[PDB]
């Protein structure tokens, strides 16, 4: 049987929250093309006390100006392939988050934020982000970062120089990130344009084409639900689909989906037999050829990036391979990744593949931990005054962040 979601959250509090400790209490605003994760830093305790505002990153204003439905409740999104591009909707989403976040005493900002950004950002869009952040809120200082790198920082034993590969899988894109001694090398770094949203759309299209009768009975919500629970990645795709060819055992492990009920009354309210689509959806990232778009795929991308390195430095970076993101939640992803890595590694070589404790939420935990240990570091954050002396597209070049190139954006 299907299940549904909820709504009407109560994320409120007093004017604001300060616990006994230090003067500054920064904010964590982990972004996301799918959903936004927020919550106060809460210094003084390593475990996350109470993350708040776990809502889909979808907003919609009233057609006639009645009200702005921005939180959980057509629809619009501020993101355009993992990079935000909407201005007004981004402002209203931020206003919703701040209003539920406890604006202290009047118009202004509370404390520095540790908002995260895509792996690579065009040097026009971070300018708009900074402008609509400062000139609309006036934060004293803001620091950027990457959610996957923050997750690895949280999962790393301690803050030190580390190297390896980071496998990120999100809503609109996936990334293979080579980090070297705690410094990301954004030169031979690659991404795959396909993500979980495209997989869900593919599964939707397949199920609509399989049952032309009730096309509107199933929607994006049910597709996401089944892709989130009734699916897994295969150790070897061709051999698995060959094994699921015999009829006696094909039905032994098939899943029944009971749609709304009141032919034996099982045509409109069918059972929606799925025994192959539960594997064709997860393997989209591994095999982009399943869609008309042609690309290398996760198996060949990291090969293309790994064969341009000398044998000496390959050993320790392969020794630390990490799986992060949203799509890295299907069971058996670790086995598939380690087998694919074993196929391409030397005969006697060694490797280690690690999966995060919470692949979707460790990004926020890592951002919180990084912000907790860098409040006093005045060389990392971007001061409010610096936005006028600096062109517009300035970065700190700190760890867990992008790379800065010397350039100025002409504009007037």
């Amino acid at each position: 049987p299907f299940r549904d979601a909820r709504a009407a959250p109560d994320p409120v509090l007093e004017a604001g929250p300060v616990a006994h400790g230090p003067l500054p209490v920064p904010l964590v605003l982990d972004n996301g093309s799918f959903q936004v994760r927020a919550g106060w830093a809460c210094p003084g305790q390593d475990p996350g006390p109470e993350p708040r505002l776990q809502f889909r990153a979808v907003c919609a204003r009233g057609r006639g100006g009645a009200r702005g439905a921005s939180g959980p409740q057509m629809l619009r999104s501020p993101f355009d392939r993992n990079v935000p591009v909407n201005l007004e909707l981004q402002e209203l989403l931020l206003d919703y988050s701040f209003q539920h976040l406890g604006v202290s005493s009047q118009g202004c900002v509370d404390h520095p934020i540790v908002l995260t950004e895509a792996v690579c950002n065009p040097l026009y869009s971070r300018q708009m982000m900074s402008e609509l952040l400062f000139e609309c809120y006036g934060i004293p200082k803001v620091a950027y970062g990457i959610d996957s790198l923050f997750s690895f920082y949280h999962n790393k034993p301690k803050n030190s120089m580390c190297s390896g590969l980071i496998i990120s899988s999100g809503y609109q894109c996936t990334h293979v990130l080579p980090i070297l001694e705690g410094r990301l090398d954004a030169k031979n770094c690659k991404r795959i344009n396909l993500g979980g949203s495209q997989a869900a759309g593919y599964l939707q299209r397949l199920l609509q084409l399989k049952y032309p009768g009730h096309l509107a009975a199933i929607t994006l919500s049910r597709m996401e639900e089944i892709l989130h629970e009734h699916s897994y990645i295969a150790e070897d795709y061709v051999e698995e689909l060959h094994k699921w060819r015999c009829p006696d055992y094909y039905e032994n492990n098939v899943h029944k989906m009971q749609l709304p009920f009141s032919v034996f009354n099982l045509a409109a309210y069918h059972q929606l037999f799925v025994g192959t689509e539960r594997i064709r959806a997860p393997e989209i990232i591994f095999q982009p050829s399943l869609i008309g778009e042609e690309q290398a795929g996760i198996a060949e991308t990291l090969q293309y990036i790994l064969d341009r390195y000398p044998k000496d430095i390959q050993e320790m970076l392969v020794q630390n391979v990490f799986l992060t993101g949203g799509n890295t939640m299907y069971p058996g992803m670790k086995a598939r990744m380690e087998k694919e890595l074993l196929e391409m590694r030397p005969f006697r070589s060694s490797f280690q593949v690690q999966l995060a404790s919470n692949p979707v939420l460790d990004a926020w935990y890592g951002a919180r931990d990084w912000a907790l240990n860098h409040l006093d570091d005045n060389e990392v954050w971007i001061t409010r005054k610096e936005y006028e002396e600096k062109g517009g597209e300035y970065l700190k070049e700190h760890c867990a962040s992008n790379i800065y190139v010397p350039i100025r954006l002409p504009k007037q």
């Binding site: 040097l123 809120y137 344009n193 399943l290 954006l409």
Partner: protein, 107 residues
């Protein structure tokens, strides 16, 4: 009740007749390409995966199994006899939907 009441536009379409929200992502990248990027300078262009040199397998469009045949009448692929009967029994709507799913020479 709000952080600021003097919010100013950042290049909207209030005056002109352009997109109200912002410039398109394609336009954004086209404008960003005009920057004098250095030869070794990173950007948003040299971050996409290269095209695969490995031939791509063929899979049944109705059952997701290893295909070994085709069909000149519809230009699809199946695996067994019942798959052939089913695909012949299907109308043109599902056929063109399957063709457009994995995009082909047919729109």
């Amino acid at each position: 009740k709000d952080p600021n009441f003097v919010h100013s536009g950042h290049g909207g379409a209030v005056a002109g007749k352009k997109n109200r929200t912002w410039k398109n992502l394609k336009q954004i990248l086209a404008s960003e390409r005009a920057l004098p990027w250095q030869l070794n300078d990173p950007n948003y262009f040299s971050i996409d995966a290269p095209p695969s040199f490995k031939p791509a397998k063929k899979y049944s469009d109705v059952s997701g199994l290893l295909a070994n045949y085709t069909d000149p009448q519809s230009k699809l692929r199946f695996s067994t006899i019942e798959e052939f009967s089913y695909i012949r029994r299907l109308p043109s709507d599902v056929v063109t939907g399957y063709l457009a799913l994995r995009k082909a020479t047919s729109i």
